[PDB]
Amino acid sequence: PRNARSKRALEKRAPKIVENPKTCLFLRGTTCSQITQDAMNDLYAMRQVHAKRFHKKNAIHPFEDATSLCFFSEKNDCSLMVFGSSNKKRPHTLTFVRMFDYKVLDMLEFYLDPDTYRSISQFKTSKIPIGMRPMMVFAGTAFESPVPNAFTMAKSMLIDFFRGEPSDKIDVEGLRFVVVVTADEPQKPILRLRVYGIRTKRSGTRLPRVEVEEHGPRMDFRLGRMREPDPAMLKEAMKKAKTPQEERTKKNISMDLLGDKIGRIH
Amino acid sequence: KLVKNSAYYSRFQTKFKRRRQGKTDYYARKRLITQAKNKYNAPKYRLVVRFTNRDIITQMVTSEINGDKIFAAAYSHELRAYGINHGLTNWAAAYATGLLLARRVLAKLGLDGEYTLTEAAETEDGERRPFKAILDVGLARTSTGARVFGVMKGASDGGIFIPHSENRFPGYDIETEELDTEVLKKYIYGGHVAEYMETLADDDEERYKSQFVKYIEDDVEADSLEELYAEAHKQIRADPFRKYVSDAPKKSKEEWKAESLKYKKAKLSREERKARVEAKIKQLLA
Amino acid sequence: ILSVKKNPSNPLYTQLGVLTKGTIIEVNVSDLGIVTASGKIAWGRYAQITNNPENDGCVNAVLLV
Amino acid sequence: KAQNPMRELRIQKLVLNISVGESGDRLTRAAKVLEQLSGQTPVYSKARYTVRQFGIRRNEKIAVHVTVRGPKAEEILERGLKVKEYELRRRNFSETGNFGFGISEHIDLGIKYDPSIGIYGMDFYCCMTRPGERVAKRRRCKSRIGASHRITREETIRWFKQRFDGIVR
Amino acid sequence: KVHAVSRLAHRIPGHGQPILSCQFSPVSSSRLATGSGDNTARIWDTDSGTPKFTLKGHTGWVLGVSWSPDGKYLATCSMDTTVRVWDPESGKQVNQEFRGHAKWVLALAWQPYHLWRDGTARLASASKD
Amino acid sequence: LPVTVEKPTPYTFDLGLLLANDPNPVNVPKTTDTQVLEQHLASVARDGAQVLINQLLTTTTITATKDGVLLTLPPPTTPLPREKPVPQPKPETKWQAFARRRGIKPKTREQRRNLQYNPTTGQWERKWGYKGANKRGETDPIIEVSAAKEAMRPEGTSVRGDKRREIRARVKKNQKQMLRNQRIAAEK
RNA sequence: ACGUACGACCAUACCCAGUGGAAAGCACGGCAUCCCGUCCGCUCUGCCCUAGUUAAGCCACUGAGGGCCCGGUUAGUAGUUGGGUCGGUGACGACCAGCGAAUCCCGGGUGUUGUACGU
RNA sequence: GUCCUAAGGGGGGCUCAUGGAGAACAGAAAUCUCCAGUAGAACAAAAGGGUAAAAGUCCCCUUGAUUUUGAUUUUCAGUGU
């Protein structure tokens, strides 16, 4: 990288101890329905700040070959991906792809129910501000599987999607919206995605009384094909790096409230 | 060879609609709304300042996913309620409109049952925080003495915390890095206009009459402008929501719907379009 | 004295902390009551030694402002 | 609708061009002629590419020009037409409605001979416009001029004949 | 309830020397008076952060500015051994300067408004003499 | 109205992610009415939002600053995959291995500064780069030249380019060593 | 419904041309003292909102030629994996499955929409 | 063999290659004007979707050539501020 700007871009794409917030690439196949496009638009609107959008048709079938997906991940530095497609067998499909080191870590299909889908514009409410992260509620007994399955995978993927940016502090005025994902264990269980705006009322106590109002979109999914990670790749992915600001604990050595280093004798 | 061919039309990528209309700088908008020093998930406000030929438009705006929201708006044609009837686009009117917007924002917030989480979790050592907003000038040039900073000065004096420096106010001296508050006071109270009125009345009486025909007709002398604008500032601070009715024709919303539908031209139906196509085919055959 | 920053004759003299004429030292300026533009208290600054301490028996310095 | 006062033709600008092809004293003298004729400081133009046949190199000042608007453009165009005896050719007028010509000696415009400067020829180019030209020039909401508001070659020829009482052959 | 001030409202220059006294008007915060070592006092409009009047006439540092309790007068005391009274709504000196102090006049105190008698106000000046 | 939700199983939380996990089953009614279905779903959302807001307001430290009323959040605890592997130390270059074997200490930042004091001019000057001391004399008016060196000099060349020649030679050798180190590290 | 200011989708919105536009609003417009910027008050900036004018911008409608966007069809077909399961020594030929196109063709369309202030 | 107040950073303004039509010398190729121009230029990389009121290009400001602090990370320290 001769150019300083290209050097900055390379350093941004370099692996780090404290990683950047993940970027999501939104793209569609050669055949994609308008319902699937509207679903993709709603998800992009919820995740605008850390997303990139493709606009062409891509002749990609992810469960056959994902070389093009890896190429797009490497080129755009996107580690989350939402891929839309349609078929006779699968009329409205959203394929969530999560990458690790520009290679496919895992994949999951979501089949969208067309008759119960409502977009964000179908609810006449105030909407979430751009860049604001919502809170998350995961409800039901389908997420407590002792063995890893499609529903635990979907919980992990949706947390990664709606995660936003990590922060040690938050304003109390930034707690006005919640994404609720409901799914129960069992013919196929339905995973329901809802978004609600939050109102607070006086209750005569210190704690306020919460009320909810529907924000959109209204989403119903059936979980389909699932590509699970290689165990070694998963181990490398769930390895946790330690920040230099996390000190290594030494035996009989501590720091007092004045910052003096204090030793213990016995 | 033809540059504009079928391949060119198929390969063409359109810009954003407001970029095509030349109204929005999306490069600046992205940094105005999606960039933050802190990540406390807090809402952000911008003071949008726009100028037309005859009016000044000031808005307090949040940015939501399906479109922007307006928290408050003040227009310079509303200054007729406070006594300013001339020069509704000048620097003094810009200051007064910014002051009006600031007072309306504070009166709407009550800084002049449902309750917020801030009041729910307020501590013992908690003080009132000022309303904060950032300036959005759009495509206007940000040079020294521009009226956008007059709107900004009016709003900041009205009580909105707007982060700013002073090197673009009228009277700023660039070599000495100092601001002439006498020139700033003159521009706030419209003394540049009054000095122009005196200068034109001394030099070119005909051009004076043509340029200030409405001032003379309404008997607004140059020496009374400072008092007029000061009294307008006092009235704005006293009653920020004074109602002003214009001389335009007044109907109800349904009456305006009917009046506009009387002049709307309806889109042709498929049957009429096919009839016209058949008539054209018959005319071509004949 | 907080530290010896730069003895002009030799980096070894700096490392040994020799206080001679022209040496840059870091001093504690809490008593002077210096506040920065952000409201923080500045308690460490740089001074230059203006005398010969080996001849005088004292260290004299001027704050670099 | 052609009798609307907002469709009235007028001169937008007049550009005076001297392409000496060589940098230095000759270009400085040509800039002196342009400054003395216009009343304002001229513009030095640099060569885009290197041509060994013309003896020029890239980024080298080889030309000078002045843009003049207002009644000053009208009076300078009047002097140029006095030099050309109010005679123009049909090929001079462009398809977009502008026109121009050239003179070989600037002395015939009314400039006294100074031996330290010399004789320079000049290119006159006049652009024509209608009111409402700001639509394509302003920064905000810049748009295209509509087709019926554009100026044609026949219209500017007719305007030239009616205004300056010249002839076009 | 008075809320704590947290930020700069205005920074207004105009004085050529350090400010030695400051006081708001008793009527409201819109009018502020300062007295400086450039031998002048100044009235400021605090709503727009602009200068309003410049009271000149002292030949020493204005050590004190003091509003009358009703707000209709401004008294200045200076190192030139004198006291002056000004009309704050027009910036003009009222009558003549008060003469009789041998040395610098350091402090002023108006008589309280409910104690004024004989159709006048009374002003006390403390001096170095 | 109550501000407490009572359920057979307690909620779990990750306040770093603003996440509430409800382990209780969502008994969705087996009806065909969208109104009652979304009413039950909104009730579940209401309970989850209520307990999340209660946990945030009661179990986190609250600080009132000029920015606003802020809650201190714990670091996130839900395990999520990284996008890229954890950075690792680079393979040792030939110089680094040689310095480790020979006990050669890294130079200090003051020792490696691009500044030196020229006695003869009494000025401070750069050692390298633009107008550095390594190019000293290339623009001086007069240069004494050796007769033997001028005789051995190639035709057309000048003594004014000798220092740039030595600089180009040194740079070429350094980049060759750097490319060899890069190739070996890529092989490893 | 129409207009304006910020917008969201970002061609159904783009490229070319014609016709019409009440009210208000936009706009063209007029003037260069002051602030400010140019070779040129062209642009930018300041002052007027009076006067002219819907000519253009803008809006609506229409029109070709492209382009673009939906839905069906292609078609569960080519193709690709499976002795998969039956024969065939085997390779392979059917059958069974799992994934799964595109061309052609047909039909429809040429902008919807949020907040605020107004007509 | 020649030249440079260095590169870099921030902000602001502007739009390119090319084609058509015009302008004394000027003629395929000098400069100037208008129209059209999805980038077909330039700069980076090696897109299967890099960048157009910019990441291009010119102005303004900085050019201070490798800051300070750390009980923290890793390595080292017979010269452990």
Swiss-Prot record, chain A:
Family named by the database record: Belongs to the RPF2 family.
Span of the entire protein shown here: 7 to 300 of 350
Subunit structure, interactors included = Component of a hexameric 5S RNP precursor complex, composed of 5S RNA, RRS1, RPF2, RPL5, RPL11 and SYO1; this complex acts as a precursor for ribosome assembly.
Task: Tell me one GO molecular function of this protein.
Answer: rRNA binding
The UniProt keyword set, sorted, is:
Nucleus
Location (main, coarse): nucleus
Every Brix domain range: 22-232
What does the entry give for GO biological process? Answer: maturation of LSU-rRNA from tricistronic rRNA transcript (SSU-rRNA, 5.8S rRNA, LSU-rRNA); ribosomal large subunit assembly
Q: Where in the cell is it found?
A: Nucleus, Nucleolus
| Task performed by this protein | Involved in ribosomal large subunit assembly.
A GO CC term? Answer: nucleolus
Oxidoreductase: present as a keyword of the record?
Answer: no
The organism's superkingdom is given as Eukaryota
- The protein here is known as Ribosome production factor 2 homolog
Question: What is the organism of origin for this protein?
Answer: Chaetomium thermophilum (strain DSM 1495 / CBS 144.50 / IMI 039719) (Thermochaetoides thermophila)
> Signal peptide position in this chain?
none
| Disulfide bridge map | none
Swiss-Prot record, chain B:
Keyword annotations: Cytoplasm, Ribonucleoprotein, Ribosomal protein
Entry-linked InterPro entries = Rbsml_uL18_euk (IPR005485), Ribosomal_uL18_C_euk (IPR025607)
Molecular function (Gene Ontology), one example: structural constituent of ribosome
A GO CC annotation given for this chain: cytosolic large ribosomal subunit
> Which superkingdom, per the lineage?
Eukaryota
A Gene Ontology annotation in the biological process aspect, one of them, is: ribosomal large subunit assembly
Question: Which locations, inside or outside the cell, does it occupy?
Answer: Cytoplasm
State how it assembles: Component of a hexameric 5S RNP precursor complex, composed of 5S RNA, RRS1, RPF2, RPL5, RPL11 and SYO1; this complex acts as a precursor for ribosome assembly.
- Describe the function of this protein: Component of the ribosome, a large ribonucleoprotein complex responsible for the synthesis of proteins in the cell. The small ribosomal subunit (SSU) binds messenger RNAs (mRNAs) and translates the encoded message by selecting cognate aminoacyl-transfer RNA (tRNA) molecules. The large subunit (LSU) contains the ribosomal catalytic site termed the peptidyl transferase center (PTC), which catalyzes the formation of peptide bonds, thereby polymerizing the amino acids delivered by tRNAs into a polypeptide chain.
In the record, the note on similarity to other proteins reads: Belongs to the universal ribosomal protein uL18 family.
Protein name (record): Large ribosomal subunit protein uL18
Q: What is the lineage of its organism?
A: Eukaryota, Fungi, Dikarya, Ascomycota, Pezizomycotina
From Swiss-Prot, chain D:
Keyword Hydrolase included in the entry's annotation: no
One GO term of the cellular component aspect?
Answer: ribonucleoprotein complex
Q: Which domain of life is it from?
A: Eukaryota
**Keywords, sorted A to Z:** Ribonucleoprotein, Ribosomal protein
Q: Does the keyword Ribonucleoprotein apply?
A: yes
Q: Which InterPro entries match?
A: Ribosomal_uL5, Ribosomal_uL5_C, Ribosomal_uL5_CS, Ribosomal_uL5_dom_sf, Ribosomal_uL5_N
| Coiled-coil portions | none
Q: Mind telling me which Gene3D superfamilies this protein's record contains?
A: 3.30.1440.10
GO MF, any single term: structural constituent of ribosome
- Give the UniProt record's GO annotations in the biological process aspect: translation
Q: Function, please?
A: Component of the ribosome, a large ribonucleoprotein complex responsible for the synthesis of proteins in the cell. The small ribosomal subunit (SSU) binds messenger RNAs (mRNAs) and translates the encoded message by selecting cognate aminoacyl-transfer RNA (tRNA) molecules. The large subunit (LSU) contains the ribosomal catalytic site termed the peptidyl transferase center (PTC), which catalyzes the formation of peptide bonds, thereby polymerizing the amino acids delivered by tRNAs into a polypeptide chain.
Family assignment? Answer: Belongs to the universal ribosomal protein uL5 family.
Q: Which PANTHER family match?
A: 60S RIBOSOMAL PROTEIN L11-RELATED
Please give the subunit comment from the record.
Answer: Component of a hexameric 5S RNP precursor complex, composed of 5S RNA, RRS1, RPF2, RPL5, RPL11 and SYO1; this complex acts as a precursor for ribosome assembly.
- According to UniProt, the name of this protein is Large ribosomal subunit protein uL5
Curated annotation (Swiss-Prot), chain F:
Region (Disordered) location: 72-93
Q: Which InterPro entries match?
A: Ribosom_reg (IPR007023)
Subcellular location field? Nucleus
Q: Does the keyword Amino-acid biosynthesis apply?
A: no
Keywords assigned? Nucleus, Ribosome biogenesis
Identify its protein family. Belongs to the RRS1 family.
Assembly and partners are described as:
Component of a hexameric 5S RNP precursor complex, composed of 5S RNA, RRS1, RPF2, RPL5, RPL11 and SYO1; this complex acts as a precursor for ribosome assembly.
Name by which UniProt lists this protein: Ribosome biogenesis regulatory protein homolog
